């Protein structure tokens, strides 16, 4: 299942969340959602739990990057103003 969630960037200051990075014999192997901290965007959702994988964050698809590319770039939007769109897959 896709579910893309958007959160408010503006009563939080952080989205709460670890990036887990699957690397298998190739190393593509996704970037999951691990542990949740309270307080943060994600947390103040709830559709997102440990386990989903992000595929697409705000307009950039990380489904065809490497582990260590799609945080970084995932970083670098989390560490800017405005609405996050998470596109999530359960």
Same mark, same amino acid.
Request: net charge negative; aromatic share 4%; proline share 2%.
């Given at each position: ?7 408010? &960037? ?10 887990? %990075?699957?690397?298998?014999?190739? %190393? ?8 949740? &901290?309270?307080?943060?965007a ?10 989903? &994988? ?37």
């Open positions: 299942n896709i579910i893309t969630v958007t959160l408010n &960037m503006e009563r939080h200051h952080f989205l709460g969340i670890s990036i887990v %990075g699957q690397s298998n014999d190739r %190393g593509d192997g996704g970037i999951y959602i691990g542990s949740i &901290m309270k307080g943060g994600v947390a103040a959702d709830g559709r997102i739990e440990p386990g989903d &994988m992000l595929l697409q964050v705000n307009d950039v698809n990380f489904e065809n990057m490497s582990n260590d590319d799609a945080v970084r770039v995932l970083r670098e939007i989390v560490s800017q103003t405005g609405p996050i769109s998470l596109t999530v897959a359960k």
